[PDB]
Design a protein around this nucleic acid. Structure first.
Length: 178
RNA sequence: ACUGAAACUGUAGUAGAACCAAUCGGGGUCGUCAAUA
């Protein structure tokens, strides 16, 4: 089994997402900025409703971003003045322009979960007295006893030539209600 | 690529129970003192 990962360097976040848009369809995304950690959803075409002004770096702009859906995850992090490295992670071999392909073999993928902050207060709201509110891109409404989880897959592979396994990556998949 | 926030080491608890400031004693009564000539 192969984990395919695609690198492009010296690329802005706005351009990195636009390069991946065919794959980041409907993808949830998390944007790290000096003052906010905002959750965003790309539309079915993989576009953001204010992508330039949201993804720019110039003024307390996004320095790191993640976007994920079922099939793939895009990661980006700033390296100089708003240019960065993009890495897209995919289960399947796919065509991208400018990106360089690579892969790593993995022994098995194991699912994980991550409970989000808050109880239920398209878009839904969780809230917790500890943090106040958290808004999540989630289309179905939430019953008062629901909790929203985030799912991921960890890929185990041999690191050492002595055969020692480790989880070489963890790709995010989707938000899920449990 | 940015300090977490907020939170009384507090609540209940008698330094107290037991232990005699007490036991015995007539306000009484006689020859001593000095050393020599």
């Amino acid at each position: 089994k192969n984990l395919y990962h695609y690198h492009q360097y010296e690329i802005t976040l706005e351009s990195a997402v636009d390069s991946c848009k065919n794959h980041l369809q409907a993808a949830i995304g998390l944007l790290y900025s000096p003052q906010k950690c905002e959750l965003v959803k790309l539309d079915n075409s993989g576009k953001l409703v204010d992508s330039y002004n949201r993804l720019k770096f110039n003024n307390l702009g996004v320095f790191e971003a993640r976007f994920f859906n079922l099939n793939c995850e895009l990661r980006w992090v700033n390296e100089s003045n708003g240019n960065g490295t993009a890495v897209l992670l995919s289960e399947s071999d796919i065509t991208l322009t400018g990106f360089e392909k690579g892969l790593q073999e993995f022994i098995t993928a194991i699912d994980q979960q991550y409970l989000l902050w808050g109880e239920p207060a398209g878009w839904q709201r969780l809230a917790e007295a500890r943090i106040g509110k958290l808004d999540i891109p989630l289309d179905n409404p939430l019953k008062p006893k629901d909790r929203v989880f985030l799912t991921s897959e960890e890929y185990i592979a041999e690191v050492d030539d002595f055969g020692n396994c480790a989880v070489i990556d963890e790709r995010l998949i989707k938000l899920e209600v449990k």
